[PDB]
Homo-oligomer: A and B are copies of this chain.
Amino acid sequence: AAPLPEGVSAEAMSSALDRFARIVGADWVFTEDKITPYEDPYTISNDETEHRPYAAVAPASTEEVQEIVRVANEFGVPLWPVSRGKNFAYGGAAPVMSGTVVLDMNRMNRILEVNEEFGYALVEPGVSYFELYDYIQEKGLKLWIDVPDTGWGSVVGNALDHGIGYTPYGDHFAMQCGMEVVLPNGEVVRTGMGAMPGNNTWQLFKYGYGPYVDGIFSQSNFGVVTKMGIWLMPEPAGYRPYLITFENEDDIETVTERLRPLKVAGVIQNGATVRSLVLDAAITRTKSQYYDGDGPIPPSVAKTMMADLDLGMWNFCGALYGPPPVMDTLWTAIRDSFADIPGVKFYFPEDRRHKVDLLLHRAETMKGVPKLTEFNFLNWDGGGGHVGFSPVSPITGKDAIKQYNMVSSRVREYGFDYMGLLAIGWRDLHHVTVIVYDKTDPDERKKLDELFNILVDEAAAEGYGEYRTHIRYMDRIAKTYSWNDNALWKMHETIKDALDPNGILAPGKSGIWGKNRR
């Protein structure tokens, strides 16, 4: 069902696939029926010709990657690199442009080094959070990792896409240090201290000397990353996870105001996440257990869910790290910041009367333990796919309540339950909207797509721009960053054409196309 990419003959694509099998072995080129796991699991498009991978190649080594790229250049065949291809909600493993060949690097799954005394790992793209965690536990190394939830994905791939987690080390790409890259011309480079032969500092110091370029290979089609370093947090002297609940939907305004100073100054040591009722309820319950109506849940049902589950309309999870005197002092500051809000409640794990419970689950994540759960937002409405919209805004009550109002209104009018959170990294607020939908139903897919377009449009007019998005929306989000007639993308295109003149790496990633396709 997948078309050849525009400009590429069937002869060309056939020679390429052939030379690919000479490079990796015939068993490691997939076509035809074996392509289905490279499809987006959470379909949005109703046009079945969109975002369709033609083929996949799975190399064993950096140098194989290089040969493939050289062949790609030779026949004009475009590649879409994935590390493990678990980018669910963002298109999974699927390309922007139909007919692109997937460059699957899952087989390159070596943990090249884990260093306990300097707190780092050097990993290939195939390495999962589960495998890294399991390695560390197995060797008994006193290190924590930082994981998404749910905890599927590549350490490399998630970091390159600017992914996040729930410890002090939650900004994954900020913790990156050193990479090896195959450039679009097939040359291989190492960044930072890795460009110096005989260094023992690749993972100890980011910059090296000269222009700092690691960042240009994140959210990018400027090269293929084959090795990447990441800093790992030493196991702390203590760990106390907490949940603060708030009774009223309006509380999120004053909560955000109080969060701002604690986060700017670092009194809260990890990202602060304040989740709406449904998002946290969906960890241990489904909709049909509280309401049989087709549409979003009414208020009386909300109050029932709150009483059963000991949750609020807003649910703030964070954690304390370090020696008990430190944790005690920080807690005093945090708790005092919220004590005077009517209806507030404060919980540590021992205060949770349920044995299967939101805090108990999130406590795992904020300690860097990768988990899958039986229930999460995906099962709230008995199944479906999801998409997320997570634009950046200032940490103010005004911005938080305005986004909650704007988004919840539209989401509910479209027939979806509102599932949103307010996330704070350091100085950055994100109102994150999660929309679960029936990806098998074309009428729902249309509604979802339309809702998504409108949410982005209306958010952008208030000055809130997206930092990470699905393959289907990459062009749209790029057009948000339109200052001076798209001057920044004009520079990205200049760099693209110099590094990749034949435009063979992931055409359209981050809205970057290349001279032959612009």
Contacts and interface: CB of A to CB of B under 8 A. Distances in A.
Interface of A: 117-120, 162, 173, 177, 183, 187-191, 193-201, 203-205, 207-220, 222, 231, 234, 236, 260-261, 264-265, 323, 325-326, 328-330, 333, 392-395, 425, 427-428, 460-469, 477-478, 480-484, 487-492, 494-495, 497-499, 510-512
B119 A264 contact: yes
A427 B392 contact: no
Contacts of A499: 491, 494-495
Given A196-B483, A427-B231, A212 B219 contact: yes
Nearest to A187: B487
B207 A467 contact: yes
A510 to B, nearest CB: 4
Contacts of A394: 118, 200-201, 204
B201 A428 contact: yes
A465 to B, nearest CB: 4
Contact of A481 (B208, B461, B495): B208
A187 B162 CA distance: 28
A37 B234 CA distance: 49
B118 A427 contact: yes
Given A196-B482, A211-B492, A326-B329, 8 more contacts: A117-B261, A118-B260, A119-B427, A203-B427, A205-B392, A205-B467, A213-B216, A326-B330
A457 B348 CA distance: 57
6 contacts: A189-B487, A196-B460, A210-B220, A210-B488, A326-B330, A491-B499
Contacts of A330: 326
Contact of A480 (B189, B209, B460, B488): B209
A208 B477 CA distance: 10
Contact of A204 (B198, B213, B428, B484): B428
Contacts of A333: 323
Most buried by B among A215, A260, A261, A466: A215
B210 A492 contact: yes
Given A264-B119, A494-B498, A212 B211 contact: no
Most buried by B among A120, A323, A491: A491
Contacts of A261: 117, 234
B491 A213 contact: yes
B212 A173 contact: yes
A494 B219 CA distance: 20
Given A213-B216, A216-B212, A195 B392 contact: no
Contacts of A260: 117-118
A210 B511 contact: yes
A510 B213 CA distance: 14
Contact of A219 (B193, B211, B220, B478): B211
A190 B119 contact: no
Contacts of A464: 201
Most buried by B among A183, A193, A326: A193
Given A510-B211, A511-B210, A483 B190 contact: yes
B189 A491 contact: yes
Contact of A264 (B118, B188, B495, B497): B118
Most buried by B among A183, A495, A512: A495
A113 B231 CA distance: 33
A213 B191 CA distance: 14
A511 B194 CA distance: 18
Nearest to A208: B481
Contacts of A189: 484, 487-488, 490-491
B483 A194 contact: yes
B201 A211 contact: no
B395 A118 contact: yes
B465 A196 contact: yes
